[PDB]
């Protein structure tokens, strides 16, 4: 399937302190693999996936030195934005960044990715061309002009198409056994009767990995639109995920309803119905 690498960076200014809290989180195929946090005893990038333990001390030192540079980049950028928006350092402010690359099943580059947010809102983004910028408002136009003048996009393009791709290739090869592993959902249906001769049927999918999953309900045949209740996919806390899909059915058609579960981990999609105790 497709592959990706992302670094999710956050800097939170701290009233009274010169240095903000800086956090950088790396992901390979939406799974955390590295982390840097400026609030640690001796701040350093640390492995977050078992397959990263094989990286030698020079890798960790090189990444840590980059994070020290980033702390300063974020500190200065937060100070500049405070001026652009006429804000007070008496309050905390948040700067975020997402960057990385996406690859196809053959591992060739599909796209580079670079965006920034200020106070949890889009600020500036690099377009898919990796040459032009989209500023979200008037203040971001100051940054866009500054970056057009310094030719910033060319340096980001070089990283996103080059180093980002080469390192992701290394991570995909090194993390192969972990990255390819799946955990199948275990499904079951529960009965929750209600008013007006109705009963809610809940189809559960538990202990699955990756998080991508589809749950469907049907009365004999044909899928059910909108009337189906669906929770957001949630972590169990052990590396697996959970999800449920429910339907309101008349108190006389329960065994007539079927749920289907679609997940890449399954030998084939699941088919189930409510079972009487």
């Amino acid at each position: 399937g497709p592959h990706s690498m992302r670094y999710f960076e956050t800097a939170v200014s701290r009233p009274g302190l010169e240095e903000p809290r800086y956090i950088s989180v790396g992901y390979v195929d939406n799974k955390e693999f590295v982390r840097f946090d400026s609030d640690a005893e001796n701040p350093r990038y640390e492995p977050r996936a078992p397959w990263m333990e094989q990286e030698g001390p020079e890798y960790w030192e090189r990444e840590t030195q980059k994070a020290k540079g980033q702390e300063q980049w974020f500190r200065v950028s937060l100070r500049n934005l405070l001026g652009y928006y006429n804000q007070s350092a008496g309050g905390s402010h948040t700067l975020q960044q997402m960057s990385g690359c996406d690859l196809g099943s053959d591992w060739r580059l599909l796209r580079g990715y670079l965006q920034f947010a200020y106070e949890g809102r889009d600020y500036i983004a690099l377009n898919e061309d990796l040459k032009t910028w989209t500023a979200a408002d008037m203040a971001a136009q100051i940054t866009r002009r500054k970056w057009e003048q310094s030719g910033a996009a060319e340096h980001y393009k070089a990283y996103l198409e080059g180093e980002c791709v080469e390192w992701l290739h290394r991570y995909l090869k090194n993390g192969n056994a972990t990255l390819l592993r799946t955990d199948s959902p275990k499904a079951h249906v529960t009965h929750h009767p209600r008013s007006k001769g109705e009963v809610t049927l809940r189809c559960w999918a538990l202990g699955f990995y990756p998080a991508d999953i589809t749950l469907t309900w049907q009365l004999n045949g044909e899928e059910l639109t909108q009337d189906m209740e669906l929770v957001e996919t949630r972590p169990a806390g052990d590396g697996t995920f959970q999800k449920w899909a429910s339907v309101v059915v008349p108190l006389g058609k329960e065994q007539n309803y079927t749920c289907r579960v679609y997940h890449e981990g399954l030998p084939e999609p699941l088919t189930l119905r409510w079972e009487p105790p």
């Binding site: 990038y45 994070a67 980049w73 950028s77 940054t143 500054k146 310094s150 980001y156």
Partner: peptide, 9 residues
Amino acid sequence: ASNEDMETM
């Protein structure tokens, strides 16, 4: 491997 940003905002 992470990237170092260019010019500040």
